[PDB]
């Protein structure tokens, strides 16, 4: 039995899915039909597109399945909820990898392609995906609400495995989502991207001061738009998780949580239009 | 200077009347009755990967298995096309190559370009330069082996030359073109060759007498490519005016034009299949078009490259065509 705002949330989520799966598969298709896009930067961008097409196709239906909340065994609900964390963390670490790649293109520009080879780009992509799998499988490594819900299952008087209404706050402990997901693997990626793009803009503006103000303002608008999309997507949901853990006698509506959830998932809709669509090689591949 | 040009003009008018005189029909109406070849859908059977810059030339060996390729990465690669194995990778002293050739014996390759040098490489010694044929004053645009001992060359200096490789001398020179010579093609019996130039003319040369027997005009712009019909009695040209034309030696005139209104790009390379029925041509529009050489309708398209087709060739046994491209790959089709 869905609510009134619950139906609007599922509608915005499937709208986000129908924007995020064709746009990201266009980026992957344009990489495959072109040979000049075999560089290191385009490996990072197709890694972001793989992570975001997995978000648009496998995190949207799992999030709607969690939000509807069917009566479900506990470990079945963990195996539903953990691919959400796996693939969304893959999105964040891919964004940090593109920022480090853009930082190396401006910092060491002459010896860039003898430092960042597609072999080293491939092990960096594998490192980001292995780290995202480690983070998302932590709530199946024994950090989960299972102890609290089994004590309530024993206090209820039922015997055996606890079967619950499968929601995200019921199987994933908020100590994981605040102390380990946000404060380690979401907020230091956001702070590193802010520091890197400040230094990228300083090095760009130092080279362009060696007709130029318009290009410098366009670069600053492009960098600030990228940082604003990451912050608007990932900070509202995690501020609400920090509110839930730190003030428990502290009320917030459920429509506010639904709004924050699809912001997190709609990061992956706006990724092919601010990362790959800004490249001129991608645009002349799109129209052909 | 006055009398000579008027006298020459009479000669031009007389040849035109003579050429028309024996034009009792056109190839198209003679060949209207035969069955059309129909659509040909050649698939890529191999993609030869390993060049790291534009490919400008290739040539099949006479064993129909080995082929040599020349690229602006400074490498001459010999491929075993059956296995995709690289047999040799020859490091070039100058990377600005425009042509390569495989000797019919399999013992030698040749290569050259903007260095104005035709370098001969002995494959049966690693492979080392055995001769650098010097003497052209413009870029080397084409070269073809009569045998291991002798190699005919074409050059941007408007001349062609026959070289004795052992002694290193131009033994016969071929002058008379008034523009850059871009391509040449050896007759099957190797006694004649034809050349194509940027004066929009083709010229038939007799190797041992050393002069031009016949000259074929008709194209509206540069001839980038030329290839003999397999019986040695005709040849085809490819031009920047987006047309191919078939020229007959004994009738001393054009027989057929191969073009489509929706084809506006230049032609870089042409070759006939073994029976002569198919004329395959490489185009600036990234595609290869396969023409029915007898009826001039397009029979098929080979669309597998991301940049200009710069070279192609059909095996001596007719089993395959290779295409080479500026996008750094070679593909084998049949």
């Amino acid at each position: 039995s869905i609510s009134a705002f619950q139906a609007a949330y599922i509608g915005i989520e499937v709208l986000i899915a129908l924007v995020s799966v064709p746009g990201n598969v266009l980026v992957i298709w344009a990489v495959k039909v072109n040979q000049a896009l075999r560089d290191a930067t385009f490996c990072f961008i197709v890694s972001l597109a793989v992570a975001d097409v997995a978000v648009g196709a496998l995190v949207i239906p799992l999030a709607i399945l969690i939000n509807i909340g069917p009566q479900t065994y506990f470990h079945t609900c963990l195996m539903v909820a953990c691919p959400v964390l796996i693939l969304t963390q893959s999105s964040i670490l891919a964004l940090l990898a593109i920022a480090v790649d853009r930082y190396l293109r401006v910092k060491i520009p002459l010896r860039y392609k003898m430092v960042v080879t597609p072999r080293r780009a491939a092990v960096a992509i594998a490192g980001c995906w292995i780290l995202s799998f480690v983070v998302g499988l932590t709530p199946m490594f024994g950090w989960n609400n299972l102890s609290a819900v089994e004590r309530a299952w024993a206090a209820n008087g039922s015997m055996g495995e606890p079967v619950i209404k499968c929601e995200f706050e019921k199987v994933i402990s908020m100590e994981y989502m605040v102390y380990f997901n946000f404060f380690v693997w979401v907020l230091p990626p956001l702070l590193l991207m802010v520091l890197i793009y400040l230094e990228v803009f300083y090095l760009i503006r130092k080279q362009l001061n060696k007709k130029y103000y318009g290009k410098e303002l366009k670069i600053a608008k492009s960098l600030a738009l990228i940082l604003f999309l990451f912050a608007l997507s990932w900070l509202p949901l995690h501020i609400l998780n920090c509110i839930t853990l730190f003030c428990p006698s502290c009320h917030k509506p459920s429509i506010l949580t639904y709004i924050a959830i699809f912001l997190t998932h709609g990061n992956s809709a706006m990724n092919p239009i601010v990362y790959a669509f800004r490249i001129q090689k991608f645009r002349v591949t799109f129209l052909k | 200077l006055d009398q000579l040009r008027q006298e020459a003009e009479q000669l031009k008018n007389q040849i035109r009347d003579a050429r028309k005189a024996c034009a009792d029909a056109t190839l198209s109406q003679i060949t209207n009755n035969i069955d059309p070849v129909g659509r040909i859908q050649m698939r890529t059977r191999r993609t030869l990967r390993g060049h790291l810059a534009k490919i400008y030339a290739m040539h099949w060996g006479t064993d129909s298995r080995l082929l040599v390729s020349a690229s602006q990465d400074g490498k001459l690669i010999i491929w075993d096309s059956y296995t995709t194995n690289k047999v040799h990778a020859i490091p070039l002293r100058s990377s600005w190559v425009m042509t390569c050739a495989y000797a019919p014996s399999g013992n030698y390759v040749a290569c050259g370009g903007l260095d104005n040098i035709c370098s001969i490489y002995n494959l049966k010694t690693n492979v080392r330069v055995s001769r650098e044929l010097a003497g052209h004053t413009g870029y080397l645009s084409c070269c073809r082996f009569l045998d291991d001992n002798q190699i005919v060359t074409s050059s941007g200096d408007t001349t062609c030359a026959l070289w004795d490789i052992e002694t290193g001398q131009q033994t016969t020179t071929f002058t008379g073109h008034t523009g850059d010579v871009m391509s040449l093609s050896l007759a099957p019996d190797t006694r004649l060759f034809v050349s194509g130039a940027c004066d929009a003319s083709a010229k038939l040369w007799d190797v041992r007498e050393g002069m031009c027997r016949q000259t074929f005009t008709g194209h509206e712009s540069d001839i980038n490519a030329i290839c003999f019909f397999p019986n040695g009695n005709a040849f085809a040209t490819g031009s920047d005016d987006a047309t191919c034309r078939l020229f007959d030696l004994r009738a001393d005139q054009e027989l057929m034009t191969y073009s489509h209104d929706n084809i506006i790009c230049g032609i870089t390379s042409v070759s006939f299949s073994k029976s002569g029925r198919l004329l395959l041509a490489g185009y600036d529009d990234f595609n290869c078009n396969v023409w029915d050489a007898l009826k001039a309708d397009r029979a098929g398209v080979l669309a597998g490259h991301d940049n200009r087709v710069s070279c192609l060739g059909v095996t001596d046994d007719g089993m395959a065509v290779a295409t080479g491209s500026w996008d750094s790959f070679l593909k084998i089709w049949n």
Binding site: R111, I204 | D73
Partner: protein, 210 residues
């Protein structure tokens, strides 16, 4: 085996092909008596000059020897990092004019099909010989429409403005104009600085920032 020979040869291809991909290739184009020769003395058919400056390998190809039409071999240099163009300032009166032929040459290479995205390094030469020859004759012999005081500074900046504004691709390529100096260090240094600016802007265009 044959696949062992194929893999050893393929290893040498990737090794030597990236070793020759960290080297800046600079096409050198100029007119006759335009000062191409002086530049190659400073920094050290087709002649290729190789020099290493500040751990950067530069390959400079002087293709002026070829007398053949450019349209048949200019596509071999489509991948050059930049084009070094040498202009003789003193040759604005010499011989249909030499500077007008050099401007027509410049406006052909700049607005080529292959050079749309490749920046052009512009070198103006003989500025010392230009200083005496600007008093014996005005620039009205070269440019009739010129209306300026007969001093080196304004006239040089006017000839530089004439050479620059022939760039129809104002968005995609940049012309870097340097008057050649007697100091050997300075001329090579400008080339390194111009190439670095080209490499940085090429890196920025692959991000999507530029």
């Amino acid at each position: 085996a044959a696949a062992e020979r194929s893999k050893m040869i393929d290893k040498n291809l990737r090794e030597d092909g990236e070793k020759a991909a960290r080297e800046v290739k600079l096409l050198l184009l100029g007119a006759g008596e335009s000062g191409k020769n002086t530049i190659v003395k400073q920094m050290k058919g087709i002649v290729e000059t190789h020099f290493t400056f500040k751990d950067l390998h530069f390959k400079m190809f002087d293709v002026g020897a070829q007398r053949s039409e450019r349209k048949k071999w200019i596509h071999c240099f489509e991948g050059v990092t930049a084009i070094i163009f040498c202009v003789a300032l003193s040759a604005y009166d010499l011989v249909m004019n030499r500077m007008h032929a050099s401007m027509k040459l410049f406006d052909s290479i700049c607005n080529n099909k292959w050079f749309t995205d490749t920046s052009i390094i512009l070198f103006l030469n003989k500025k010392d010989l230009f200083e005496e020859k600007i008093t014996h004759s005005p620039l009205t012999i070269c440019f009739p429409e010129y209306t300026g005081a007969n001093k080196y500074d304004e006239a040089a900046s006017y000839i530089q403005s004439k050479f620059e504004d022939l760039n129809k691709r104002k968005d995609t390529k940049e012309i870097y104009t340097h008057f050649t100096c007697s100091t050997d260090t300075k001329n090579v240094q400008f080339v390194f600085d111009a190439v670095t600016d080209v490499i940085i802007k090429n890196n920025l265009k692959d991000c999507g920032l530029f």
